[PDB]
Nucleic acid binder design. Structure first.
Lengths: 51, 61, 197, 48, 106, 172, 127, 122, 58
RNA sequence: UUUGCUCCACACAAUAUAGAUGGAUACGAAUAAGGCGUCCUUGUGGCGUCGCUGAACCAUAGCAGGCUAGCAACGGUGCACUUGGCGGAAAGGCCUUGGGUGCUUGCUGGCGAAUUGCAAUGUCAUUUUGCGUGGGGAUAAAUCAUUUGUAUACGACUUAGA
RNA sequence: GCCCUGAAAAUGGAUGGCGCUCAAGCGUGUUACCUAUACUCUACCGUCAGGGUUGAUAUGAUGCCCUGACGAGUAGGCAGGCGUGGAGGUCAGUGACGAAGCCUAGACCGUAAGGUCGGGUCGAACGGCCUCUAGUGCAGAUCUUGGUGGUAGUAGCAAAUA
RNA sequence: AGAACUGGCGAUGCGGGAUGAACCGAACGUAGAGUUAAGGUGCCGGAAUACACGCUCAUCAGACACCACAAAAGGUGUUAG
């Protein structure tokens, strides 16, 4: 009778996509990334910094 | 504001009951609305719908 | 924040002023303008003269009487340029105009009491240093006002009577200032010093 | 359509309105420019 | 001792409106001192009360009251929309009103 | 417009059977975001080679941040603006802290001195003119002297309140 | 005694008077839609008598309910009255205007010992 | 009923400018008053304290008559009559008061203040 | 509603009164530790002409 | 006209509010310049200082502010007198001398407050008038009617009449 | 580019007005802000549509209930309702202890047509429901008949000597 | 005056264009809250006497579509080129 949406109601948010229990504790949406910091070619930079 | 694709509030066009006040004929109908809503048989649906037809759609067989 | 905001007129620019003074009335705030002949207007003298002359020829045909009355008194000018800035035809507008009082020079009541100023209207806080402005009293006189002299005479009187009051206040301020100088350095004055005073 | 034959208007407008003056004694709207140097003399009078 | 104001001086300006259609269901008050929508927020909720004097005395007073409450900021000069159990008179545009400090959040 | 961003967008027609790996074209575009950047890209591109969004693709679209975002520099400019009359070429100079802001000052100077909307404006030769004396306009040649200095006459202290009690000074 | 009735709203309380029912005394206050081609009230302008739309219909939950959550039912004589012996909480007995001052008192006497709410318990109650 | 009527000085004591002297209207009124004063005597009242309380004169059935206007048209010549009626009352003194006591309905915090007030003083 | 207003005849509970001091003393002994706090408390509140509760601090 | 009329101090009823709820807190002139202090040889001077808002200054603690005890100062100060002066631009206000009288939160005490029950403006301003107090003061005219003609359609105007 | 000139018409006069001159102008870019019967959520009405539901020792399955959408509208079409005269039936209906009618800035119901009640007035019939029936609903028609205004105590009642 | 396509108006209110059948926005059950469109935010009037770059001085300024008209031709006025 009432369209209680998720996003601002953790109770319904779990009544659909039960993965929001695991997503919570795991954090996930904020989980860090790997610093596989490589290097961009010398060409890339001289063409990006052209006149 | 809505760009109606279709003509709003179409009264369907089909009959929902016999235009007559034939008490007995109205009983058969209440008998068949039931059958056509519980038996599930396609037969009752046609027979029910068939009671609502005027004398020009109930030709003398 | 006070019941009456006596507003000094000198330097102010008609329109700008007229507007804030008009919003303060339609807000309940009571107001009284003073020195309306020291009131300035944008544009040079000759322009503001033609503009009054192009309004001076605007009267009702069949009866120059029931026509648009052309007031020459600086107070009434600034006022007509404030009327158009209020719904004076409604009771509310009629009412707001009864909170307003525009005076030439500075009459007896509004002289013993402090008059303020509106920065957002003032000439020397607007007009790009260089543009030619116009003094009201000057224009008005050249369009019917016949009391230019009478005021210059009275304010001259008041300015000297006031200058004498401030001279007493000049030494009286320095008087208490000198007592406040030695009262400082004391244990009760240094207590407030840390308490932001 | 114009007047046809321009002719001086009848009457002086600066003498309006032609209403019955308030009092029988014509008020003296203005008196001579004051001369602070002469004897203190009178400026008008009341005749018949 | 001489002052006892536990509220703030607000002025009832005009009703929420357009160029030619005012909606009396909502008013607009210019609170004393407030001038920004950020610092206006601290007044939201604060039950408002327009106090006026009547001739005929009711349950026991000749000074009846109109209750309201700030509902939201409005504009950029610290004005706030207010609603009352019964919308305001209109004869009160330029009438000093009272903004209390409750419900208090501090 | 907003705060520009000198985007770098390269396109290269589209890999056709006969001509695979087509000569890429790099355009140093200006705009307030990326889509305006791309649009403006074909816009100029199709005004050089028979190539438009339908026949081509957007290789890469990387932004281009200023070299020394705190190094006040002189700028040289060449603009191909279409005035109401027809179209003209010109060279203005805007000494500022970056290409992006100097071009922002330019565009609004194009709207003030020659009423030309961003739409009737093509930005040609735009680079930082190295040494002075290379400054062809005196209005820039001005702020280029031995340890300059100047006052700010008539300060106009903007008021917060409606009324004052202290009639305003303009000393600085 | 009235069954728990939801807050009775009305949406529009001001009666719908014919347009100009004030201008001319001939034009009765009785509502009538303006069929006119130029009629401003029909064209529905900004500031003219709001016409009776169906949208002003009342909550079927509170339609016919008088201020005391009771639907009023006209009562002729006592025989007619006892139709409410089993609905003292839903209806209110309304004595008709053609009921004698003597008969009314008999009806009230019956309606009181039955627990019915007579809406007009003052009709011809001359002391 | 005074449009185009003449002006007169005698109408100053009332505050108007228009005032006529309806000799007939008066003779029928003072003539009828004569009758009122006489009814008061046979009813036994004070000929002094007597004053007119209610005097109402309204339209009567217009006496019909005709007049001939040019081109042989017949325009009416109505005779608007009256229906005067009045009441001479004995003038009584003391308007009196006979005011209502007024049942006060003050709230508990409205009594409290009255209680706390008459608690510091009398 | 039959006396209105015939004073009290209902004032206070000797209990409630004594219970005050039972606590009053406890805090009173706490207030004479912080200077002027007794004065600050025997003092009422009020907003001054040029007092802003939003840009204020308590 | 039986004592009507008016001014003051009140007293109580009526009365309304374009809207008190700490204080409208007085140079002038300038603004590509000023204020303030101060110095001399007094100037369109020298020197110091300040501004960047009133976000100031004043007021402000006490049953809307009570009852008492003082301490220290003799200041501040409210009301009502009083002295002298100033102000006519709408002066109707500002300044002053001296008594009086209440308070003083500049410092320290002691009592009081509750039940308005967990908020309900929670009533404290000033406007007008009326009816009753007793206390001063003052004893007219206008209009109509008559009259005139410098006036006039009528009103109006202008004269005259104990 | 801005600006000046080129730029002459009749009642006084219109960037809408006032007024605006580092604008409240012209150009531009940035924000925040404002408010339509539109958009979003919700409540209520109605229409439409899709379904549910005999169910027992109860009362409407042209019933109750759930569900979704939509609502402008002259000419016009249809459907559902309100009202009036009279007809068959019905309430063993109302009534001289006051019917009908009329009055009522008195109350209630209905979106509405209208219905209902109190008070007043009044004096002899009348109403609800089920059907039947029609000379069945008025603001116009330079409508008919009758009646009454403003006009207006106005025009004017002035030839024939008095 | 007469055609084409489309949209309107007619028949359609509403908010803006001061004002207006046709333009901008937008289509109407009755309410509430929110958010906007169009258009605007000195005062009239709800909304910044907001921000920034500039240009402009007119003894006949200029002021935002339909829209309430202005030109060819001139200016050592000034700005930029």
């Amino acid at each position: 009778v009432l369209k209680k949406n998720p996003l601002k109601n953790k109770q319904v948010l779990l009544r659909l996509n039960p993965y929001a229990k695991v997503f919570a504790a795991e954090k996930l949406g904020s989980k860090k990334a790997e610093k596989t910091g490589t290097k961009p070619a010398a060409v890339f930079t001289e063409t990006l910094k052209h006149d | 504001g809505i760009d109606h694709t279709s003509k709003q509030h179409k009264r369907s066009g089909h009959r929902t009951a016999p235009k007559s006040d034939n008490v007995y004929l109205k009983l058969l109908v209440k008998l068949y609305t039931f059958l056509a809503r519980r038996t599930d048989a396609p037969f009752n649906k046609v027979v029910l719908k068939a009671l609502f037809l005027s004398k020009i759609n109930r030709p003398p067989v | 924040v006070e019941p009456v905001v006596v507003i000094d007129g000198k330097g102010h620019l008609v329109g700008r002023l007229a507007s804030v003074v008009a919003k303060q009335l339609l807000n309940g705030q009571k107001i009284v303008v003073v020195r309306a002949e020291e009131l300035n207007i944008s544009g040079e003298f000759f322009r503001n003269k033609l503009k009054y002359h192009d309004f001076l020829r605007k009267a009702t045909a069949f009866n120059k009487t029931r026509g648009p009355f052309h007031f020459r008194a600086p107070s009434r000018i600034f006022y007509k340029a404030l009327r158009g800035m209020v719904s004076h035809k409604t009771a509310r507008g009629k009412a707001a105009l009864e909170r307003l009082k525009v005076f030439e020079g500075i009459p007896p009541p509004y002289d013993k009491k402090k008059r303020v100023v509106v920065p957002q209207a003032l000439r020397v806080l607007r007009l790009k240093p260089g543009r030619k402005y116009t003094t009201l009293g000057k224009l008005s006189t050249s369009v019917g006002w016949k009391y230019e002299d009478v005021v210059a005479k009275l304010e001259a009187k008041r300015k000297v009577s006031s200058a004498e009051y401030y001279a007493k206040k000049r030494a009286f301020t320095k008087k208490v200032a000198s007592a406040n100088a030695t009262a400082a350095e004391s244990d009760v004055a240094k207590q407030l010093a840390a308490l932001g005073y | 359509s114009h007047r046809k034959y321009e002719a001086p208007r009848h009457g002086h407008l600066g003498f309006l309105p032609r209403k019955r003056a308030a009092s029988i004694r014509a008020r003296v709207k203005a008196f001579p420019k004051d001369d602070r140097s002469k004897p203190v003399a009178l400026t008008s009078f009341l005749g018949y | 001792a001489e002052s006892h104001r536990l509220y703030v001086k607000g002025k009832h300006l005009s009703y929420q409106r357009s160029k030619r259609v005012n909606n009396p269901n909502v008013s607009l008050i210019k609170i004393e001192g407030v001038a920004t929508p950020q610092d206006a927020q601290f007044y939201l909720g604060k039950r408002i009360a327009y106090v006026y004097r009547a001739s005929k005395e009711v349950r026991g007073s000749k000074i009846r009251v109109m209750w309201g409450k700030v509902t939201r900021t409005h504009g950029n000069s610290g004005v706030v929309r207010a609603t009352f159990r019964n919308n305001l008179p209109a004869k009160t545009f330029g009438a000093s009103v009272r903004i209390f400090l409750y419900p208090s959040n501090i | 417009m907003a705060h520009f961003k000198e985007y770098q967008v390269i396109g290269r027609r589209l890999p056709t059977e006969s001509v695979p790996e087509p000569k890429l074209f790099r355009m140093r575009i200006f705009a307030s975001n990326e889509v305006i950047a791309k649009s403006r890209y074909w816009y100029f591109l199709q005004k050089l080679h028979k190539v438009k969004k339908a026949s081509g693709e957007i290789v890469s679209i990387n932004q281009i941040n200023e070299a020394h975002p705190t190094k006040v520099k002189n700028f040289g400019v060449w603009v191909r603006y279409d005035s109401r009359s027809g179209t003209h070429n010109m060279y203005k100079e805007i000494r500022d802290v970056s290409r992006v802001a100097a071009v922002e000052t330019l565009y609004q100077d194009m709207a003030a001195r020659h009423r030309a909307r961003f739409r009737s404006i093509h930005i040609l030769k735009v680079a930082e003119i190295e040494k002075t004396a290379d400054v062809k306009r005196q209005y820039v040649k001005q702020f280029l002297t031995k340890d300059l200095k100047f006052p700010l006459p008539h300060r106009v202290q903007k008021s917060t309140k409606t009324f004052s009690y202290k009639r305003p000074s303009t000393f600085y | 005694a009235s069954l728990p009735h939801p807050k009775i709203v009305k949406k529009h309380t001001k009666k719908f008077k014919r347009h100009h029912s004030d201008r001319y005394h001939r034009v009765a206050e009785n509502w009538r839609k303006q069929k006119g081609i130029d009629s401003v009230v029909r064209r529905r302008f900004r500031g003219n008598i709001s016409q009776p739309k169906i949208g002003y219909g009342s909550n079927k939950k509170t339609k016919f309910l008088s201020p005391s959550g009771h639907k009023t039912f006209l009562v002729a004589n006592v025989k007619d009255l006892e139709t409410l012996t089993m609905h003292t909480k839903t209806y209110a007995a309304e004595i008709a205007h053609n009921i004698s001052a003597k008969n009314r008192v008999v009806i009230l006497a019956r309606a009181k010992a039955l627990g019915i709410k007579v809406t007009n318990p003052k009709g011809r109650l001359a002391l | 009923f005074n449009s185009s009527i003449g002006r007169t000085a005698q109408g100053k004591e009332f505050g108007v400018t228009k005032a006529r002297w309806p000799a007939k209207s008066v003779k029928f009124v003072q003539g009828l008053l004569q009758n009122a004063a006489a009814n008061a005597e046979a009813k036994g009242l004070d000929a002094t304290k007597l004053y007119v309380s209610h005097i109402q004169v309204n339209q009567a059935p217009k006496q019909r008559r005709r007049t001939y206007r040019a081109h042989g048209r017949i325009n009416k010549y109505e005779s608007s009559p009256s229906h005067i009626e009045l009441v001479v009352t004995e003038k009584e003194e003391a308007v009196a008061k006979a005011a209502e006591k007024k049942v006060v309905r003050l709230t508990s915090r409205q009594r409290g203040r009255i209680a706390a007030q008459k608690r510091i003083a009398a | 509603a039959n006396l209105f207003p015939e004073q009290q005849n209902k004032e206070i509970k000797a209990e409630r009164v004594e219970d005050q001091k039972v606590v009053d003393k406890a805090l009173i002994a706490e207030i004479k530790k912080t200077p002027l706090l007794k004065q600050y408390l025997s003092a009422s509140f009020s907003l001054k002409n040029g007092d802003k509760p939003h840009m204020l601090k308590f």
